[PDB]
Amino acid sequence: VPGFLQQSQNSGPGQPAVWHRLEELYTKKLWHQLTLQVLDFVQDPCFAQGDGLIKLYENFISEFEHRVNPLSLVEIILHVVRQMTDPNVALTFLEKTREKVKSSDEAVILCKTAIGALKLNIGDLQVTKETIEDVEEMLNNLPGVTSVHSRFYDLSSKYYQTIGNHASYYKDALRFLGCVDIKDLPVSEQQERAFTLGLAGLLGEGVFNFGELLMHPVLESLRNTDRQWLIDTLYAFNSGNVERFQTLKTAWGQQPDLAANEAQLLRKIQLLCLMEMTFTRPANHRQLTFEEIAKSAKITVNEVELLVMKALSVGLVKGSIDEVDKRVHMTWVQPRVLDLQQIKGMKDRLEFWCTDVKSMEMLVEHQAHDILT
């Protein structure tokens, strides 16, 4: 063991020096240096499988060290899977070691996240999907580790792999944003994940929130690397509605997913156009001609007499609709987010009216000052 670390363990440049330092930590009993510095050398991927094979020998050293499992065991397992390569039964062994030795219950939930990922690789939407449900129970309500919630997101993203349910993907990606420590995530790797998020991830019908996720800053900046026109087309479906020029562009932006759901997405933009008139314009411009709705639903004006009824049928938002000109002037609507900087919320609509009221309130006081007494 001491001899093994001194010469055989060394592989990459600087490994003999770091392993000699590791021996000093082993004698000094400084678990923290072993927990962070030794695992940091393990974190480097240049060694790949070779560090992982050494890691099994180091795991025996780690058992003597008795470093905290939530930090030490998870890092060891992260490179243990690299050593495992294809783990037909290797996965059972690593899970067995994690189950047998648990510093804390939180480490046990971390073990579950690994079990689900390994099961996902070998099997789809079976025990692994149920294990993803089990991990939700194991996580409970504790987000203090935060990285553990990211591991929980990883199985949630794995659930998106198991069933297309792009809505589940939309929820997990949002969960990842909350449980990620910050932009400390590798920017290029996240930009590459955002390239997929920009492509299939947002092309999936699961996310279309008028910028609730699309206009969120971290992902959109990473999605700038992904084709800008496709990213614009995603905003265009939600707020640009029909966006017929963008409709030609969306086929260019991503042929996969868009072509499969083009009819369904066309229906979704038609529904989006109906929601758009009421929330964006309150009264006045909210009322609009049938031909504008025909352009909004990208359908013929004669067809829109039939089409407006179908869009009205979805009834996502309760309202009042008049078919004299197909004008909206409807009641309740839910905007995913307000446009621009909420200019309507400023003196354009609100606040300015409130200023007018207090002057009239003063008129009531002037009308009857003696009565106020």
Add this chain to the structure above:
Amino acid sequence: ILAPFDNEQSDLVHRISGDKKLEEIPKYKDLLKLFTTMELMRWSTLVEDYGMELRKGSLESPATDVFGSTEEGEKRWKDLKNRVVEHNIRI
């Protein structure tokens, strides 16, 4: 499909709906349209959807319950048109 809308009918349809064995059957997916408000279902579209009900060729075992023939079938055929027409007015 052959029974008129009632408070009892709605509670019963929800209880039957969601059975795992029922989920496997394609017809159950067609039957769900009445259970949900589903806006309006046109009868002409339903005839295309339920052409299988007349002769599935794989199941069709309870098809006698619906359009079996005339006395217990044509009466059922009129009932389906009436119940969907009733669905159209209710929504």
